[PDB]
Specification:
With 223 residues, this protein is mainly beta. It has two domains: 120 residues, Trypsin-like serine proteases (Thrombin, subunit H, Beta Barrel), CATH 2.40.10; 103 residues, Trypsin-like serine proteases (Thrombin, subunit H), CATH 2.40.10.10. The chain has two helices and 13 strands; from the N terminus they run βββββββββαββββα. It has a seven-stranded antiparallel beta sheet. Strand 11 and strand 12 form a beta hairpin. The protein is globular and about 45 Å long. The structure holds the ligand Cc1cc(Br)c([O-])c(-c2nc3cc(C(N)=[NH2+])ccc3[nH]2)c1, calcium ion and chloride ion (CL). The site of the ligand Cc1cc(Br)c([O-])c(-c2nc3cc(C(N)=[NH2+])ccc3[nH]2)c1 has 12 residues, from strand 12. Chloride ion binds next to loops. GO terms for molecular function: endopeptidase activity; metal ion binding; serine-type endopeptidase activity; serpin family protein binding. Belongs to the peptidase S1 family. Its cofactor is Ca(2+).
């Protein structure tokens, strides 16, 4: 997260860190046994780390659970990143409490101007790499579809939306991929891609979760 602030320990209880010997992507807990992340964060050997604040220190509240299976959307296109969503089933259910809690899926899509909270342990520098130890947060609005398409002509599908600042300086970045974009208490986006990080007129692009709620429910119900 570039231009964001320190969230504060456990203030984002649905945030998870996907780990393979190091943090490589974020994710959101939607119930005690399932996490939603981005398809491009897929790899085998994933350990889901819940209740984290400093990812390099065991401070208490952490729950480390191995992934039992990861389900990448069947129509995921790695070249366009269209359908960039993945579900991860945990080997055992997590213990939910005030520090580890799930976030609700939306019933309707959000409108442009909606203010959302984006969080993650991704890079904090737009020109260079500085990875933080604690969770960073950023409040960012959803942009209109015309501004989004004007910024990325021919690359925005109906399963994506832009959120951020066109002046540059505040944005999600590598390492934040897979994490949550929460607006009014509902998970509306998943950190997916963008051109560089925090560059002027190149806002972040997010997977539009409201388009996948029936797919997530049906897939969870059959697995
Ligand atoms: C080299 C590399 C590898 C991976 Br895997 C990423 O997810 C990314 C990446 N760049 C990103 C840029 C943004 C942004 N909002 N500007 C968001 C997620 C990103 N993820 C970059
Ligand atoms: Ca820790
Ligand atoms: Cl277009």
């Amino acid at each position: 997260i570039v231009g964001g602030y320190t969230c504060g320990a456990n203030t984002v209880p649905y945030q998870v860190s996907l780990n393979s010997g190091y943090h490589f992507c974020g994710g959101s807990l939607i119930n005690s046994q399932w996490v939603v992340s981005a398809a491009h964060c897929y790899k085998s050997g994933i350990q889901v780390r819940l209740g984290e604040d400093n990812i390099n220190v065991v401070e208490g509240n952490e729950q480390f659970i191995s992934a039992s299976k990861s389900i990448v959307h069947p129509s995921y296109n790695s070249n366009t990143l269209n359908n960039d969503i993945m579900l991860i089933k945990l080997k055992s259910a997590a213990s939910l409490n005030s520090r580890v809690a799930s976030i609700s899926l939306p019933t309707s899509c959000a409108s442009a101007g909606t203010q959302c909270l984006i969080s993650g342990w991704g890079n904090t520098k737009s020109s260079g790499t500085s990875y933080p130890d604690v969770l960073k947060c950023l409040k960012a609005p959803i942009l209109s579809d015309s501004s989004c398409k004007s910024a990325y002509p021919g690359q925005i599908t109906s399963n994506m939306f832009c959120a951020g600042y066109l002046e540059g300086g505040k944005d999600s970045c590598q390492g934040d991929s897979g994490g949550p974009v929460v607006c009014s208490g509902k998970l509306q986006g998943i950190v997916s891609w963008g051109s560089g990080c925090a560059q002027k007129n190149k806002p972040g692009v997010y997977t539009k979760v409201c388009n996948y709620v029936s797919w997530i429910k049906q897939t969870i119900a059959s697995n």
